[PDB]
Design a protein around this ligand. Structure first.
Ligand SMILES: [Cl-]
Ligand code: NA
Lengths: 223, 163, 223, 163
């Protein structure tokens, strides 16, 4: 997250970390046994970590739980980046506490101008690299689909939205992949891609979770 | 699908670190630039025997993850990360053919992937993303090996972090 | 470990666990910064866990340090299983205490009849599977090279030895790979392979660490 | 070098669990045993349309690691882990060719590997360990597909844990 602030403990309880010896992606706890993340974060034997604020230290409030089933969206298309969503079923239920809670799914899509909370442990610099120890947070507005298409002509599908600032300075970045964009108390977005980080006219592109709710509910139901 | 890995056993990062491409069957050569046709400035990417371990490269995806998998479409470039100079592309040019060259512009999605091959990796070029890929290999000319499409005969590399 | 006992906290301070979202191999801490394990345990982005006894829970005495370097022996041969050894330089020093301490290298090879301590979190059953929460330990003797070659004709090299019981019932097993064989207070072996576990005339086969000490020393000195 | 993974995204285990090999192109079929020549007992490994989801397999390596990589030589067997029954081997037999069959002996090191191929995995047979492999494909005969060496034309499988 470039140009954000330290979230604090307790402030983003639904944020999880996807791990396999190292942190590689964000994710959101949507109920006690199901995590959602990005399809491009798919890896064998993912361990989900919850209750982490500082990723580098064992705070004790953590819970480390393995994936039983990692389910990429069946139309996920690595050539186009479309359908960038994965569901992880945890092998055991997450016990809920001050630093672990679920975020619920939107009943409708979010509008342009709505202010969203985007969070992660990714790079905090637009030029060069600097990776934080604690979870960082950023408030960013949803942009109209027309301006998203203008920023990235050819690449924006119906299942993507843009959020952030065409000024630059404030954006998600490498390491934030899979993480939450939460608007009006609902999981509306998943950190996906962008041209650089926090560059002028180049906002974050996020998976549009509202289109996937019927798939998510069906997938959880049947598995 | 699989994570791309350096000689020390670590995942290859997205943009943040530079890496030497060390050939397994041409150990004393390393990446450099050379002139091709009637061009004044050297813009062809070659493996130069007189240059080792050579110019390092970065691997860049627009995806907001800090590792590279073998399924990601990449830009490959010399020089610093955020820049648009030193960006690899493939260009039809005599006497080399489908030559790997450097340019000053960078698409959102680059045309290359790094794929496991034998005891290291090969660079693969995709003229369009939906299609099958063309291995990057070597064209011997002027006492140097120009990188070019040469499907069936990849140049196999270890990826060594510049540290 | 089949037919063994619960080691206990403090008793095998040099045992580590190789991790990438799940436990997959053992290792031995040979100084503050360097772990030895098996070559066939090589994986990208390994994290090492030290001070662990119960691998499942987060006791607090655990150090979780990533591998910065994972150096497989340059003559490692997957066709023949020969030279099955790997060094892992940790990205930081392990802080040493009651539960975390190194084991030293031999100055000479071990003899037949010498008793060894073998340890790990592997399968504790010789048919079927049961994986233990806590580290298991086994006293087992080094077998003569003659009886090792008779057990496995054509497969024992000069970089291997056998330990255990020709009767069966007591052996290392799947999940113990990479783990220490300590005889006379020294690291004499690494858990490598065998036919089944704890079967008749099929003892455990271990990488002969005395043959690699000058390589280990040389490698640590130049990395 | 990469870890073999099941349909749920989890590492395939060394002997511990059994797995259905589910073909991607012949969806309505599963592993079975059938007769070859003038043989009384069914000894050939076939993909039978009238046998679904099929007999599940175990993958076995003598290495004391509980996961399988694509670089490990394996035995593949029907039935229980510790047995020497139902063990796959390749045997020259008319009219099939180099046929995958079952036997009642298990070598320390088996002759198979499971390698990534397209959108799943292929079984590859090695006559000896130091050599190049031979893809296992399908010989269509008697309304069933006999598994046999068919190099270039591998049967691509998904590996579904039996549970
Ligand atoms: Cl992997
Ligand atoms: Na017969």
């Amino acid at each position: 997250i470039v140009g954000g602030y330290t979230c604090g403990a307790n402030t983003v309880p639904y944020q999880v970390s996807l791990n396999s010896g190292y942190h590689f992606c964000g994710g959101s706890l949507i109920n006690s046994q199901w995590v959602v993340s990005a399809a491009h974060c798919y890896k064998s034997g993912i361990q989900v970590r919850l209750g982490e604020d500082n990723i580098n230290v064992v705070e004790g409030n953590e819970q480390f739980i393995s994936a039983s089933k990692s389910i990429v969206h069946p139309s996920y298309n690595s050539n186009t980046l479309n359908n960038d969503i994965m569901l992880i079923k945890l092998k055991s239920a997450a016990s809920l506490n001050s630093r672990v809670a679920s975020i619920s799914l939107p009943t409708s899509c979010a509008s342009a101008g709505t202010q969203c909370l985007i969070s992660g442990w990714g790079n905090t610099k637009s030029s060069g690299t600097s990776y934080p120890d604690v979870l960082k947070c950023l408030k960013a507005p949803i942009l109209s689909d027309s301006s998203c298409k203008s920023a990235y002509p050819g690449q924006i599908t119906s299942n993507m939205f843009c959020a952030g600032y065409l000024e630059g300075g404030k954006d998600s970045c490498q390491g934030d992949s899979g993480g939450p964009v939460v608007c009006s108390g609902k999981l509306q977005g998943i950190v996906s891609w962008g041209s650089g980080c926090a560059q002028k006219n180049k906002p974050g592109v996020y998976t549009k979770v509202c289109n996937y709710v019927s798939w998510i509910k069906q997938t959880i139901a049947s598995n | 699908s699989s994570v791309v890995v350096d000689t020390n056993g670590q995942p290859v990062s997205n943009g943040a670190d530079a890496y030497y491409l060390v050939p397994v069957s041409h150990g004393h050569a390393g990446l450099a630039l050379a002139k091709i046709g009637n061009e004044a400035e050297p813009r062809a990417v070659v493996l130069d025997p007189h240059h080792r371990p050579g110019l390092p490269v970065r691997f860049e995806s627009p995806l907001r993850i800090n590792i590279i998998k073998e399924s990601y479409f990449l830009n490959i470039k010399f020089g610093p990360s955020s820049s648009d100079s030193g960006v690899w592309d493939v260009i039809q040019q005599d006497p080399i053919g489908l030559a790997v060259k450097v340019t000053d512009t960078k698409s959102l999605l680059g045309p290359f992937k790094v794929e496991k091959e034998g005891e290291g990796y090969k660079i693969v070029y995709y003229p369009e993303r939906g299609q099958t890929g063309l291995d990057i290999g070597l064209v011997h000319r002027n006492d140097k090996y120009y990188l070019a499409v040469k499907d069936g005969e990849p140049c196999v590399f270890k990826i060594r972090k510049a540290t």
